[PDB]
DNA sequence: CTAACCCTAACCCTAACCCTAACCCTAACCCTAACCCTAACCCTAACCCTAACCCTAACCCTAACCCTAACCCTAACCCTAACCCTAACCC
DNA sequence: GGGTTAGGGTTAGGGTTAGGGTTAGGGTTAGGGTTAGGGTTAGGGTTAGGGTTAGGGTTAGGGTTAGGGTTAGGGTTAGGGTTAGGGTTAGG
């Protein structure tokens, strides 16, 4: 069983992300809030991809199903896939 | 030896001028697989899908950080707070 | 003469768009001038995008088209930003537009 | 194996027509292909919606012209309309 | 004189089935008709997209079931799926 | 008719004809319209049940757009399913914020000279 | 016609929206935003009416333009 | 005779409990026709379209006022400012 | 013509990014035995090609009995002045 | 914790204009007139679409070893709060 994977996002990673996004000062609970938001978004995206893979009569999620789920959610992605 | 609140702009420019990835690969793949195991087990990933999901999450986090920084600047505060991310998630419409 | 590219004065294929429209089941009857119009619009859009990418590459002292140059040309043009608003480009980048308050003062 | 579309030769020809001293990569070619596919899908959807709203069965150049005028803002819309009308007149005269 | 759809008699029958002591107005009937038309258009679009993605020409109940599972959240999705499967079994058992 | 065989009230042939005329696919099945009619029937039943509950809570025996707007904004699932949906002559929720309140009396009547 | 939106109208709109205090330039900013939105909607409706080979804008074209912009409207029309 | 900052809640509740229209009909129709005359002249309106546009503008203004009030409450200020509507228009995505 | 907002000028600390050195996890490969994807008919039962006369579904017929805004009348749902835990913070 | 001391809502009584009921003709719908136009099947083969074997060129999936984060920690000063009425400026 896989556990302790939610704490995989280290503090320097979020610090570099905030520095790239233009944030010059970070508090304390911002890391936990961003972790929860990313977890919720990943859960929704994975659920959509699982539904698409089950509709396609497959098991391994491919890049085409990921692009389809991203277009259904409302955020297109170019470059990856086709 | 430098003063605080001055060397942060150099790191910001260095991270903005580069287009490399900041999040790792093995922990992200482990977290994605652990989340996918909650719905249906015996699931595989062709790496490219995990990279696409990581890029999408990076873009979403960058946009959220930009919105939070803009809201904090408008609120006369260089630092951010959980109430700022709450206001961002409330105004953006996402829950 | 034999192809539509030598008659319409374009380079994008018209029969491919016509076959895609006929196979996509978008309408009962797909015209013949409508695919030519769509090919001309796509050709103009591709020419403008390539011109912006070449300008960005020449400004960045590069002779090739990289996703960074495309992202810069998209974010720089106001019309391209409105046409492609919620479009995420992988390995593209962001603009280093620092705010007026975020300064050493 | 199979066969894919891959809009690459036409994009390379257009690039060599506007600038023969520059090139393109595989990632940029995939991005351009995805953008062209998205634009074509949006145009097809707008044309289908216009045909379903006008209670018609055929599709003419006026539907795609209106779809371009609605999707594109202003200057780009007028330029695309002019270029499309010029191409239509050139194809009709010859 | 033309002819319009106007989904009103079926809505009135359903309302009398669930609550025969209440009624409906013309504005509420138009709102319900617009909502039903929008739901039907969304379902048709999702089914067409799924058929174009799966490289198929026909449309079965599995496509609409997946479209409902994707559009509806959770509890409503599971309830609609159960009611649709029950209706399908009832229509199949009784020719 | 299919209503006496499937145990429903919504028309199936109408949805089938609409799907065949809309040019959505080359072949439209026969069980798929039944599934869509069942889903629409369940959704209409839930919406009518919420509207009747709102009308009974508002001491009314009819369905008005205000009751529909209240039932839509009250349910969390209906708010997520119909997010950016504007209903004419519907209304808004009178959920006053915690800060927008008369609060208390500072110095009797905010007077330091008394 | 731009000054047709009177001050009491915006005051009642702000009171209905939950605003308990209004400044000064808020009225002018809301007027400009409404003017821009009306201009865009009228342009879309004019394009739809020109595509439909008509002149008078009907409610169906208005509903179509509202659905294209991304904000559906129920009740009015069909 | 009442105190300030107390009778506003009564008017807010009275305006929220009612579902009537606040904007007039003739000035709105005149403004709509004046705006439509800039693109193409000789245009007519079947009243219902103007009412639908007025309802849409009312809903948009209500949503914008709600967002501005929420942002002002978060910014520790009961009143609103043009910078608040600018932040609202910037975060919502509609232009800028 | 009224009192609560209101915005910067007196003063606060607990939160808060920069930091070098013990650190001991992950990333280019490595086969390998277990396994899901795609090609030739078999053949088979359900739906397109289209009759029949039907049983059912849209405007209106004049009333039908419980739907409008408002016509006399009772009385209490927010307005304001004392009042009792409750967590807050500096001994 | 405890030195007391700014600060949180709050309900007895007073307040009168704001809810309570209310009420009458036509305004607003629902069971009645009919026929024609789609809803719904009943006769004929067929072509897009399911069942099943194997094989095949992968590709997700077992592991090495060495260095850039990694966090190991702190300051102290810097960007955060905490407020005085001052005219004042928007509120009925």
UniProtKB/Swiss-Prot annotation, chain A:
Mutation effect (residue 20 to L): In TEBIVANED4; results in early developmental defects when expressed in zebrafish embryos
The PTM N6-succinyllysine maps to: 11, 57, 59, 71
Q: N6-propionyllysine (modified residue): where?
A: 11, 24, 57, 59, 71
Residues modified as N6-acetyllysine are 11, 71
Covalent cross-link Glycyl lysine isopeptide (Lys-Gly) (interchain with G-Cter in SUMO2) as placed by the record, residue numbers = 11, 39, 59, 71
N6-lactoyllysine: modified positions: 11, 57, 71
| Cellular compartments annotated | Nucleus; Chromosome
Instruction: Kindly list the positions at which N6-(2-hydroxyisobutyryl)lysine occurs in this protein.
Output: 11, 24, 39, 57, 59, 71
Q: Which residues carry this modification: Phosphothreonine?
A: 60
Modification sites for N6-butyryllysine? 11, 24, 57, 59, 71
Which disorder is it connected to?
Tessadori-Bicknell-Van Haaften neurodevelopmental syndrome 1: An autosomal dominant disorder with onset in infancy, characterized by poor overall growth, microcephaly, hypotonia, profound global developmental delay, impaired intellectual development, poor or absent speech, and characteristic dysmorphic facial features, including hypertelorism and abnormal nose. Other variable neurologic and systemic features may also occur.
Name of the protein in its database record: Histone H4
Q: Which organism is it from?
A: Homo sapiens
Whole-protein residues included: 22 to 103 of 103
From Swiss-Prot, chain D:
Gene Ontology biological process terms from the UniProt entry = antibacterial humoral response; antimicrobial humoral immune response mediated by antimicrobial peptide; defense response to Gram-negative bacterium; defense response to Gram-positive bacterium; innate immune response in mucosa; killing of cells of another organism
Cite a single GO MF annotation.
structural constituent of chromatin
Source organism per entry reads: Homo sapiens (Human)
Residues modified as N6-(2-hydroxyisobutyryl)lysine? 4, 13, 16, 27, 55, 78, 86, 90
Annotated positions of the Phosphothreonine modification: 85
Chain positions found as Dimethylated arginine: 49
Kindly list the positions at which N6-lactoyllysine occurs in this protein: 13, 55, 78, 86, 90
- Which sequence positions carry the modification called N6-malonyllysine? 86
Name it. Answer: Histone H2B type 1-K
State the covered range within the intact protein.
32 to 125 of 126
Report the residues modified as N6,N6-dimethyllysine: 27
Annotated positions of the PolyADP-ribosyl glutamic acid modification: 5
N6-methylated lysine (modified residue): where? Answer: 86
Modification N6-methyllysine, positions:
16, 78
The UniProt entry lists the main location of this chain as nucleus
Carrying N6-acetyllysine, the residues are: 55
Q: Which domain of life is it from?
A: Eukaryota
What does the PTM comment of the record read? Monoubiquitination at Lys-4 (H2BK34Ub) by the MSL1/MSL2 dimer is required for histone H3 'Lys-4' (H3K4me) and 'Lys-79' (H3K79me) methylation and transcription activation at specific gene loci, such as HOXA9 and MEIS1 loci. Similarly, monoubiquitination at Lys-90 (H2BK120Ub) by the RNF20/40 complex gives a specific tag for epigenetic transcriptional activation and is also prerequisite for histone H3 'Lys-4' and 'Lys-79' methylation. It also functions cooperatively with the FACT dimer to stimulate elongation by RNA polymerase II. Phosphorylation at Ser-6 (H2BS36ph) by AMPK in response to stress promotes transcription.
Q: Into which family does the record put it? A: Belongs to the histone H2B family.
Swiss-Prot record, chain F:
Q: Write down the SUPFAM superfamilies for this protein, in alphabetical order.
A: Histone-fold (SSF47113)
Alphabetized, the UniProt keywords read: Acetylation, Chromosome, Citrullination, DNA-binding, Hydroxylation, Isopeptide bond, Methylation, Nucleosome core, Nucleus, Phosphoprotein, Ubl conjugation
Q: Does the keyword tRNA processing apply?
A: no
Residue positions, PTM N6-succinyllysine: 80
Q: Which modifications occur after translation, per UniProt? A: Monoubiquitination of Lys-104 (H2AK119Ub) by RING1, TRIM37 and RNF2/RING2 complex gives a specific tag for epigenetic transcriptional repression and participates in X chromosome inactivation of female mammals. It is involved in the initiation of both imprinted and random X inactivation. Ubiquitinated H2A is enriched in inactive X chromosome chromatin. Ubiquitination of H2A functions downstream of methylation of 'Lys-27' of histone H3 (H3K27me). H2AK119Ub by RNF2/RING2 can also be induced by ultraviolet and may be involved in DNA repair. Phosphorylation at Thr-105 (H2AT120ph) by DCAF1 is present in the regulatory region of many tumor suppresor genes and down-regulates their transcription.
A single GO molecular function term of this UniProt record: DNA binding
Return the CDD domains for the record. Answer: HFD_H2A (cd00074)
Cross-link Glycyl lysine isopeptide (Lys-Gly) (interchain with G-Cter in ubiquitin) maps to 104
Which SMART domains would you find in this protein's record? H2A (SM00414)
Origin: domain of life = Eukaryota
Q: According to the UniProt entry, which residues carry N6-(beta-hydroxybutyryl)lysine?
A: 21, 80, 103
Post-translational modification N6-(2-hydroxyisobutyryl)lysine, affected residues:
21, 59-60, 80, 103
Q: Which residues carry this modification: N5-methylglutamine?
A: 89
Under InterPro entries, the record lists: Histone-fold, Histone_H2A, Histone_H2A/H2B/H3, Histone_H2A_C, Histone_H2A_CS
**A cellular-component GO term for this protein:** CENP-A containing nucleosome
Which family is it part of?
Belongs to the histone H2A family.
Protein's recorded name: Histone H2A type 1-B/E
Species, as recorded: Homo sapiens
Gene that produces this protein: H2AC4
UniProtKB/Swiss-Prot annotation, chain H:
GO process annotations (BP): chromatin organization; epigenetic regulation of gene expression; gene expression; nucleosome assembly; telomere organization
How does the record describe its quaternary structure? Answer: The nucleosome is a histone octamer containing two molecules each of H2A, H2B, H3 and H4 assembled in one H3-H4 heterotetramer and two H2A-H2B heterodimers. The octamer wraps approximately 147 bp of DNA. Interacts with TONSL; CHAF1A; CHAF1B; MCM2 and DNAJC9. Interacts with NASP; NASP is a histone chaperone that stabilizes and maintains a soluble pool of Histone H3-H4 dimers.
The chain residues annotated with the modification N6-methyllysine are: 17, 25, 40, 83
Modified-residue entries (Phosphoserine), positions: 18, 47
Question: What is the protein name for this chain?
Answer: Histone H3.1
Regarding protein family, the annotation reads:
Belongs to the histone H3 family.
N6-acetyllysine found at: 17, 40, 76, 83
N6-succinyllysine modifications at:
17, 40, 83
What role does it play? Answer: Core component of nucleosome. Nucleosomes wrap and compact DNA into chromatin, limiting DNA accessibility to the cellular machineries which require DNA as a template. Histones thereby play a central role in transcription regulation, DNA repair, DNA replication and chromosomal stability. DNA accessibility is regulated via a complex set of post-translational modifications of histones, also called histone code, and nucleosome remodeling.
The upper taxonomy is: Eukaryota, Metazoa, Chordata, Craniata, Vertebrata
- PTM annotation (N6-crotonyllysine): residues: 17
Locate the N6-(2-hydroxyisobutyryl)lysine modifications and list their residues.
17, 25, 40, 83
Source organism of the structure = Homo sapiens (Human)
Residue positions of the PTM N6-glutaryllysine?
Answer: 17, 40, 76, 83
Q: Does the keyword Phosphoprotein apply?
A: yes
Q: Where are the transmembrane segments?
A: none
Residues annotated as carrying N6-lactoyllysine in the record are 17, 40
Its signal peptide is none
Entire-sequence positions represented here: 41 to 136 of 136
The primary site where this protein sits is nucleus
Question: Where in or outside the cell is it found?
Answer: Nucleus; Chromosome
Q: Which residues carry this modification: Phosphothreonine?
A: 41, 68
Q: Which residues carry this modification: Phosphotyrosine?
A: 2
